[PDB]
């Protein structure tokens, strides 16, 4: 039975103060390398342990004794998506009933039917990069985020963002960015009654108004004229024969559309980021494209066969996953590790990235971009690679995410050569999900047509 270690006090301010700053993911992995493998994180009026061994995280992800529980970054997330699927407790009325009703829209046959409008948006990417001029480059995490926004707009709801009409980012990202952007703040925010945060309050009311106005536009259009908003307007949960309410409907709608502009553009942003750090990896991807990709459009099959591609994707994810913590409470009474006792209701943070650098299950070599480390997924230890979050609570769009990024990177390394022709150094935005910011790239054309 050992004491957990806790990083520095600040009086009343507990901790907090340590995390004043636009990346608080990346200040807590500096504490994790600090303070090692468990440490004790309080705020004001509550408290968190941060995990980063595959040997506590193991017992963590152990549904009989853990459940998730909502950060405090979820709980103000709540404010616009609800109780939508990713910010519902367990037990709560509308998580069981939601997760049965949408559990077909992530069926076989579904992803088969999502297939041709990914190309549809994938070679709208591609056309846009064809037509750019010699003196122009390519903004990385912007271009990533018109694709996957138009992509889940097409697939789930038949409504086009149409983003690549736009030179700004679409007004629904605009305003969910700022919202998030918002919620970061508030996580800072010791005093949130001063009136110095009214105008804060006011735009972040406009934001949820403009995204709600949006929703509105998807479900007229519906109206007016089978996929994802099929299955929520019409479907009912197989227990009970209950449909969801109109007001749960609009927050999943929102849900989804938020996997749209943070996420899978993340992944697709880091693996380019990679790629053009690692030459001989890029040059490997395009031997792989080339061979694969024989058709103008890539069809289902062939996107299964881009197997290298699919290990890059995974290695992106191990060392920046775009989700990096999940968090969960004891469901009982328990001792992790043999070593610190927890009570009932105790919260538990997962740190991602620290848990992918684990040296005990990655080897020494955990900072090196090695896709290679994929080639026998059966050979990583349990419980030590965890980008889609663990148990009944994980992602249900992992097998949809990994189509599109394995499609769309497949298609770009078809059909440009990429030159990192500012040396860029990674910067990454923090929103409670991570992107690379300032990425820009320029391509050359290797003259394919579609
Ligand atoms: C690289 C891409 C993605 C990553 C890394 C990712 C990661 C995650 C993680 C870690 C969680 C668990 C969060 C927690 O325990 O608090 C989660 C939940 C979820 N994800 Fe994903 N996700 C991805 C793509 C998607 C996509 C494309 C969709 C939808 C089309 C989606 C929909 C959801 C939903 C609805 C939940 C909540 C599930 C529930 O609690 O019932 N995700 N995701």
Known sequence: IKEMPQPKTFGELKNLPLLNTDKPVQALMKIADELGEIFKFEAPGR???????????????????????????????????????????????????????????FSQQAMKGYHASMVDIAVQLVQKWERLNADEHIEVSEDMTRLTLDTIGLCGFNYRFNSFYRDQPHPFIISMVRALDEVMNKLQRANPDDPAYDEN????????????????????????????????????????????????????????????????????????????????????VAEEAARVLVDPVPSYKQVKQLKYVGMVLNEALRLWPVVPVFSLYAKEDTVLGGEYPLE???????????????????????????????????AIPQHAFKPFGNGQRASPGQQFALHEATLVLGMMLKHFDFEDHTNYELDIKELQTLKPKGFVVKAKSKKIPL
């Open 47 to 105: 408290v968190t342990r941060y995990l980063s061994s595959q040997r506590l995280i193991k017992e963590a992800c152990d549904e009989s004794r853990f459940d998730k529980t909502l950060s405090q970054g979820l709980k103000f997330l709540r404010d616009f998506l609800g109780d939508g699927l990713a910010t519902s407790w367990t037990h709560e009325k509308n998580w069981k009933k939601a997760h049965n009703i949408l559990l077909p829209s």
């Open 344 to 378: 009932k209701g105790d919260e538990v943070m997962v740190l991602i990235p620290q848990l992918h650098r684990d040296k005990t299950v990655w080897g020494d070599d955990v900072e090196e971009f090695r896709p290679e480390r994929f080639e026998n997924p059966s």
């Open 201 to 284: 309050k006011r735009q972040f009311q406009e934001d949820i108004k403009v995204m709600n106005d949006l929703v509105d536009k998807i479900i007229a259009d519906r109206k007016a004229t089978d996929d994802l908003l099929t299955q929520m307007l019409n479907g009912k949960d197989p227990e009970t024969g209950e449909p969801l309410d109109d007001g749960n409907i609009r927050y999943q709608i929102i849900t989804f559309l938020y996997a749209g502009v943070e996420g899978t553009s993340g992944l697709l942003s880091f693996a380019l980021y990679f790629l053009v750090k690692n030459p001989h990896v890029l040059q490997k």
